[PDB]
Swiss-Prot record:
The protein's role, per its UniProt record: Involved in the biosynthesis of the yellow-orange carotenoid staphyloxanthin, which plays a role in the virulence via its protective function against oxidative stress. Catalyzes the head-to-head condensation of two molecules of farnesyl diphosphate (FPP) into the colorless C(30) carotenoid 4,4'-diapophytoene (dehydrosqualene).
Binding site for Mg(2+) 1: D48, D52
A Gene Ontology biological process term: carotenoid biosynthetic process
Catalytic reactions of this protein: 2 (2E,6E)-farnesyl diphosphate = 15-cis-4,4'-diapophytoene + 2 diphosphate
Keywords: Carotenoid biosynthesis, Magnesium, Metal-binding, Transferase, Virulence
Gene transcribed to yield this protein: crtM
CDD domains, alphabetized: Trans_IPPS_HH
Protein name per Swiss-Prot or TrEMBL: 4,4'-diapophytoene synthase
Residues holding (2E,6E)-farnesyl diphosphate 1: H18, S19, K20, S21, Y41, R45, R168, Y245
The keyword Protein biosynthesis is assigned to this record: no
InterPro entries: Isoprenoid_synthase_dom_sf, Squ/phyt_synthse, Squalene/phytoene_synthase_CS, Trans_IPPS_bact-type, Trans_IPPS_HH
GO molecular function: geranylgeranyl diphosphate synthase activity; metal ion binding; squalene synthase [NAD(P)H] activity
UniProt organism field: Staphylococcus aureus
Cofactor, how bound (note): Binds 2 Mg(2+) ions per subunit. A third Mg(2+) ion binds between the 2 farnesyl diphosphate (FPP).
Top-level taxonomy: Bacteria, Bacillati, Bacillota, Bacilli, Bacillales
Keyword Metal-binding applies: yes
Length: 281
């Protein structure tokens, strides 16, 4: 394998370490598109994890800026060379939405002084910032002729996936001093996350959970309805990634909404879902 191959392999490793679901699905893509997703995904992970000060994140942002300004120049990257070298390689062949990386970065800067979200509007704006932006960056990789609707579908999918993630992680997020449900919705449903964490679920909580799960599932259906904005090769894969991810909701239900472990979709169940999906492709 070439030096660049090694860079992409490292990007793969970061993706698979962070998400078996997304790696499971996206490693099914043809080589070229597969590798581009690894790099973009790895950059987004490095960004999301960075603060845990801002130094490295400033360096990531500066590296991304160098690539945007001078895609074909050799740069001595300040942050992670392997990842930036791969991103640069991708950017030389695809139209990367750099402002989307900057939106993600800005959101991550903001998460430092995390304050709970007043309304759902603020929560959904967060979902765009950390996840819709990722859909936007992935768009040119996963579609042939991108237009406003391609970006919109990808953005909505990203956002739904984030919401599902939040719904899986209420417990662990609370332990790390984060509550992503909005005050508006929490107060409406009469839920105190600390209280549920100490005492177990009740009917108020389950109702609030199901309110957000309803939103996620409906967005999923609307994304599926528009699957054809994506390249034919990427369609079943994107569908798969979504389906695997939405199955998480049922795992949460089957575990009775527990706030004390991370539920998951077995590897063998992921294979079943994929089989299901191709019985129509
Ligand atoms: C057309 C392209 C389809 C769009 C794909 C978007 O992929 C993304 C991007 C960003 C976030 C998520 C949700 N997600 C999943 C696992 C996870 O661990 C976290 C976390 O750690 O928060 C998390 O947010 C998914
Ligand atoms: Mg995940
Ligand atoms: Mg994220
Ligand atoms: Mg989470």
């Amino acid at each position: 394998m070439t030096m660049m191959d090694m860079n992409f392999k490292y990007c793969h490793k970061i993706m698979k370490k962070h998400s078996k679901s997304f790696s499971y699905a996206f490693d099914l893509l043809p080589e070229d598109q597969r590798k581009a997703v690894w790099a973009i995904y790895a950059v987004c992970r490095k960004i999301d994890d960075s603060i845990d000060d801002i130094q490295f994140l400033n360096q990531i942002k500066e590296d991304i800026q160098s690539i945007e300004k001078y895609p074909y120049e050799y740069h001595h990257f300040q942050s992670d060379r392997r990842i930036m070298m791969a991103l640069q390689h991708v950017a030389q062949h695809k139209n990367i939405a750099f402002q989307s990386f900057y939106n993600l970065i800005d959101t991550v800067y903001k998460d430092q002084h995390f304050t709970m979200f007043e309304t759902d509007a603020e929560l959904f704006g967060y979902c765009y910032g950390v996840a819709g932006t990722v859909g936007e960056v992935l768009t040119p990789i996963l579609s042939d002729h991108e237009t406003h609707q391609t970006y919109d579908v990808a953005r909505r999918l990203g956002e739904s996936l984030q919401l599902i993630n939040i719904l899986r992680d209420v417990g662990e997020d609370f332990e790390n001093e984060r509550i992503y449900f909005s005050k508006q919705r929490l107060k409406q449903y009469e839920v105190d996350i600390a209280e549920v964490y100490q005492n177990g679920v009740n009917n108020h909580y389950i109702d609030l959970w199901e309110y957000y799960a309803a939103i996620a599932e409906k967005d999923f259906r609307d994304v599926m309805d528009q699957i054809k904005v994506f390249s034919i090769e990427a369609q079943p894969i994107i569908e798969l990634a979504a389906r695997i991810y939405i199955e998480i909701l049922d795992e949460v239900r089957q575990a009775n909404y527990t706030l004390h472990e991370r539920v998951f979709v077995e590897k063998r169940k992921k294979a079943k879902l994929f089989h299901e999906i191709n019985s129509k492709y």
